[PDB]
Design an enzyme around this catalytic site. Structure first.
Site, mmCIF file in Angstrom:
data_model
loop_
_atom_site.group_PDB
_atom_site.id
_atom_site.type_symbol
_atom_site.label_atom_id
_atom_site.label_comp_id
_atom_site.label_asym_id
_atom_site.label_seq_id
_atom_site.Cartn_x
_atom_site.Cartn_y
_atom_site.Cartn_z
ATOM 1 N N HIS A 70 0.000 7.249 10.887
ATOM 2 C CA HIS A 70 -0.135 7.330 9.430
ATOM 3 C C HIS A 70 -1.628 7.178 9.129
ATOM 4 O O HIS A 70 -2.334 6.486 9.863
ATOM 5 C CB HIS A 70 0.606 6.179 8.756
ATOM 6 C CG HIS A 70 2.069 6.118 9.079
ATOM 7 N ND1 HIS A 70 2.731 4.931 9.324
ATOM 8 C CD2 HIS A 70 2.992 7.099 9.214
ATOM 9 C CE1 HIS A 70 4.010 5.187 9.549
ATOM 10 N NE2 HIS A 70 4.189 6.494 9.507
ATOM 11 N N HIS A 87 -2.531 -2.630 7.325
ATOM 12 C CA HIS A 87 -2.320 -1.236 6.904
ATOM 13 C C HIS A 87 -2.690 -0.970 5.454
ATOM 14 O O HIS A 87 -2.618 -1.863 4.612
ATOM 15 C CB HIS A 87 -0.851 -0.829 7.041
ATOM 16 C CG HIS A 87 -0.161 -1.407 8.233
ATOM 17 N ND1 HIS A 87 0.863 -2.321 8.120
ATOM 18 C CD2 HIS A 87 -0.336 -1.196 9.559
ATOM 19 C CE1 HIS A 87 1.284 -2.656 9.326
ATOM 20 N NE2 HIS A 87 0.573 -1.991 10.216
ATOM 21 N N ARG A 136 5.081 -8.804 4.328
ATOM 22 C CA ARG A 136 3.758 -8.591 3.760
ATOM 23 C C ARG A 136 3.259 -9.931 3.234
ATOM 24 O O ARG A 136 3.845 -10.486 2.313
ATOM 25 C CB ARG A 136 3.848 -7.555 2.632
ATOM 26 C CG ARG A 136 4.493 -6.236 3.077
ATOM 27 C CD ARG A 136 4.767 -5.250 1.937
ATOM 28 N NE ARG A 136 5.530 -4.112 2.462
ATOM 29 C CZ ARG A 136 5.673 -2.932 1.861
ATOM 30 N NH1 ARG A 136 5.105 -2.695 0.678
ATOM 31 N NH2 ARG A 136 6.387 -1.980 2.457
ATOM 32 N N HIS A 142 0.018 -8.371 7.418
ATOM 33 C CA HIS A 142 1.408 -8.667 7.762
ATOM 34 C C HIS A 142 1.654 -9.958 8.542
ATOM 35 O O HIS A 142 0.737 -10.527 9.131
ATOM 36 C CB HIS A 142 1.988 -7.489 8.539
ATOM 37 C CG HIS A 142 2.369 -6.330 7.675
ATOM 38 N ND1 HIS A 142 3.667 -6.091 7.285
ATOM 39 C CD2 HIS A 142 1.626 -5.332 7.142
ATOM 40 C CE1 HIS A 142 3.710 -4.999 6.543
ATOM 41 N NE2 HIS A 142 2.483 -4.527 6.433
ATOM 42 N N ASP A 152 -2.762 3.418 8.992
ATOM 43 C CA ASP A 152 -2.629 2.514 10.149
ATOM 44 C C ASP A 152 -3.947 1.931 10.650
ATOM 45 O O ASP A 152 -4.721 2.625 11.322
ATOM 46 C CB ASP A 152 -1.889 3.221 11.295
ATOM 47 C CG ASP A 152 -0.451 3.557 10.939
ATOM 48 O OD1 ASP A 152 0.111 2.930 10.000
ATOM 49 O OD2 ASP A 152 0.127 4.447 11.588
ATOM 50 N N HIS A 182 -1.160 0.834 2.380
ATOM 51 C CA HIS A 182 0.128 1.294 1.888
ATOM 52 C C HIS A 182 -0.073 2.296 0.766
ATOM 53 O O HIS A 182 -1.136 2.329 0.149
ATOM 54 C CB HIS A 182 0.985 0.109 1.441
ATOM 55 C CG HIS A 182 1.536 -0.681 2.585
ATOM 56 N ND1 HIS A 182 2.887 -0.849 2.792
ATOM 57 C CD2 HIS A 182 0.916 -1.291 3.624
ATOM 58 C CE1 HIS A 182 3.076 -1.569 3.883
ATOM 59 N NE2 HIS A 182 1.896 -1.845 4.409
ATOM 60 N N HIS A 218 4.256 6.403 12.811
ATOM 61 C CA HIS A 218 3.367 5.245 12.902
ATOM 62 C C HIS A 218 2.612 5.212 14.219
ATOM 63 O O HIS A 218 3.162 5.547 15.273
ATOM 64 C CB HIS A 218 4.154 3.946 12.732
ATOM 65 C CG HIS A 218 3.316 2.710 12.804
ATOM 66 N ND1 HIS A 218 2.517 2.291 11.761
ATOM 67 C CD2 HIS A 218 3.170 1.788 13.785
ATOM 68 C CE1 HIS A 218 1.896 1.175 12.106
ATOM 69 N NE2 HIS A 218 2.278 0.846 13.328
ATOM 70 N N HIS A 252 3.670 2.607 4.480
ATOM 71 C CA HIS A 252 2.337 2.944 4.988
ATOM 72 C C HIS A 252 1.893 4.275 4.381
ATOM 73 O O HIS A 252 2.706 5.187 4.210
ATOM 74 C CB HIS A 252 2.358 3.065 6.513
ATOM 75 C CG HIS A 252 2.675 1.784 7.219
ATOM 76 N ND1 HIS A 252 2.704 1.685 8.592
ATOM 77 C CD2 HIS A 252 2.943 0.540 6.746
ATOM 78 C CE1 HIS A 252 3.006 0.446 8.937
ATOM 79 N NE2 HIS A 252 3.151 -0.271 7.836
HETATM 80 CU CU LIG Z 1 2.177 -2.522 6.269
HETATM 81 ZN ZN LIG Z 2 2.039 3.117 9.901
#
Ligand SMILES: [Cu+2]
Ligand SMILES: [Zn+2]
Ligand SMILES: [Cu+2]
Lengths: 152, 130
Positions: free
Chosen positions: A79, A45, A142, A119, A82, A47, A70, A62
């Site tokens: 988002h 993702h 993360r 992640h 994503d 952020h 999400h 995110h």
């Molecule tokens: Cu993330």
């Molecule tokens: Zn997301």
């Protein structure tokens, strides 16, 4: 526009991801590789913040300028940040080759100066029946991140 | 509008620099500290690319959309720490002089203000902050 991100973290996880957008409102190609990962799927993702002063923690949530839920499939609610999952092989290498229609490198809601994060676990793409799915995709911690910068 | 940059290199030079711009048409406040420097003046520039794939080398030249990245010099005290407190109205966190996603670099030598600043000691990508 071209952009690039050097992903680094406390562990063996590291990589480089490239971004390219040929036209203002064109698709964004996302490609590169990440290593040091456990075999399987890893959430991927953009952020909100390009703040790495406390490691990946300071990147915030995110990137979600439209205040939506999400997701992942670019044809359903998500988002902006994503980017679904990367897949690591048996040697822990995830080769990435994505085209996304929702992120952009210019204009409104662009991702330049924000943080790319890989992640611990698989992103469930907002398909789970729990609150966490609608917020993070249950992708867990993360592992590595970097600020997305303008490239030549 | 706020930005931040973590300066790192392959030597002892390291720091954190903050950027704040309350008004789009006003000056950017630049502040933080850099440690591990030799005593004296050091070139302090925004470079064109936020590309750290080859360390500071991949940051490219002095940022110049017209230099806009000309932030002059920081002064390291005898303990090797430079306190940075700058107000600049040429750089911006939005619009055409936008430095977000570019690289902040601290140099080995002084910028002679016309830039002979030598090696790039530490750098980081300028990111959006909360
Ligand atoms: Cu993330
Ligand atoms: Zn997301
Ligand atoms: Cu320079």
């Amino acid at each position: 526009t071209k952009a690039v991100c050097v992903l680094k973290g406390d562990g063996p996880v590291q990589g480089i991801i490239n971004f390219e957008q040929k036209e203002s409102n064109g698709p964004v190609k996302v490609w590169g590789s990440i290593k040091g990962l456990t075999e399987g799927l890893h959430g991927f993702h953009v952020h909100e913040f390009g703040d790495n002063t406390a490691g990946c923690t300071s990147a915030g949530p995110h990137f979600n300028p439209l205040s939506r839920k999400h997701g992942g499939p670019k044809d359903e609610e998500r988002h902006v940040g994503d980017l679904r999952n990367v897949t690591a092989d048996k040697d822990g290498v995830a080769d990435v080759s994505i085209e996304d229609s929702v992120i952009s490198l210019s204009g409104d809601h662009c991702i330049i100066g924000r943080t790319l994060v890989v992640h611990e676990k698989a992103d469930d793409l907002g398909k789970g029946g729990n609150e966490e799915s609608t917020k993070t995709g249950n992708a867990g911690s993360r592992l590595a991140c970097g600020v997305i910068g303008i490239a030549q």
